[PDB]
Design a binder for this molecule. Sequence first.
Ligand SMILES: CCCCCCCCCCCCCCCCCC(=O)OC[C@H](COP(=O)([O-])OCC(O)COP(=O)([O-])OC[C@@H](COC(=O)CCCCCCCCCCCCCCCCC)OC(=O)CCCCCCCCCCCCCCCCC)OC(=O)CCCCCCCCCCCCCCCCC
Ligand SMILES: CCCCCCCC/C=C/CCCCCCCC(=O)OC[C@H](COP(=O)(O)OCCN)OC(=O)CCCCCCC/C=C/CCCCCCCC
Lengths: 62, 53
Amino acid sequence: DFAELLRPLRSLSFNQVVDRYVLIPPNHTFYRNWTYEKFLGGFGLSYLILRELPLRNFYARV
Amino acid sequence: IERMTEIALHVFRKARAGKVRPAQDVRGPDGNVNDFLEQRRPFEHPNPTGVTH
Ligand SMILES: CCCCCCCCCCCCCCCCCC(=O)OC[C@H](COP(=O)([O-])OCC(O)COP(=O)([O-])OC[C@@H](COC(=O)CCCCCCCCCCCCCCCCC)OC(=O)CCCCCCCCCCCCCCCCC)OC(=O)CCCCCCCCCCCCCCCCC
Ligand SMILES: CCCCCCCC/C=C/CCCCCCCC(=O)OC[C@H](COP(=O)(O)OCCN)OC(=O)CCCCCCC/C=C/CCCCCCCC
C-alpha cells in the first residue's frame, strides 16, 4: 500500500512530475469557495422545501 | 304598511338564519364571540386526523 501511493510517480520522470504536480499554471479566476456556498447554502434551500411538509399536526413539524 | 312590513321581516330573518352565512355579529346568543378562535376549555378534541385514501 505504501508502494501504491507512488504508482503515478513511477511512470513519470522528475521533470514530468514537477510540471504535473508542482508547476500548476497560475489561474486565480476560479470560484473556489463555491464548494462551501453550495453545501452551507443548501441548508437554506432545504428549509424552503422542508417548511412545506404536508404533516397534519403542527407539533409533528415542530 | 307597518303590519305588512313585520310580516316580511319575520320571513326574512327566518330565511337569513336558514342560510349558511359567515358570522356577521360579534356575539352569538351568549356573550361569547362567534369566531373559530372562541374555543376555550374544556379540552375535548384529539389530534387532527389525516387524509383518507
Ligand atoms: C416523474 C415522476 C417521478 C418519477 C421518478 C421517481 C423516482 C425519483 C428518484 C430519482 C430521480 C431523482 C433525481 C435526482 C437524482 C438524485 C439521486 C439521489 O440518490 O439523491 C439522493 C438524495 C441525496 O443524497 P445525500 O447524499 O444523502 O444528501 C442528503 C444529505 O442529507 C445531505 O446532507 P449533508 O450534510 O451532506 O449536506 C448538507 C445539504 C443540506 O441537506 C439537508 O440539510 C437536508 C437534510 C434532510 C432533513 C434532515 C432530517 C433528516 C431526515 C432523515 C429521514 C429522511 C429519510 C428519507 C428517505 C427518502 C429516500 C429517498 O446541503 C448540500 O449538500 C447541498 C444542497 C444544495 C445543492 C443543490 C441541491 C439541488 C437539488 C435539486 C434542485 C431541483 C429540484 C426542484 C426543487 C424541489 C421541487 C420544488 O437524497 C434525497 O432523497 C434528498 C431528499 C431531499 C428532498 C427532495 C424533495 C424533492 C424531490 C424532487 C422530486 C422531483 C421534483 C418534484 C416533481 C413533482 C411531481 C412528481
Ligand atoms: C433570467 C436570467 C436572470 C439572471 C439574473 C439577473 C441579474 C444579472 C446580473 C449578473 C451580472 C453578472 C456579473 C458577473 C457575475 C459573476 C458570476 C460568477 O462569478 O460565477 C462564478 C462561478 C463560475 O465558476 P468558475 O468556473 O470557477 O469561475 C470562472 C470565472 N470565469 O459560478 C458559479 O459558481 C456557479 C453558481 C452560479 C450562481 C448559482 C446558480 C444557481 C442559481 C439557482 C437557480 C437555478 C435554477 C435551476 C437550476 C437547475 C438545478 C437542477
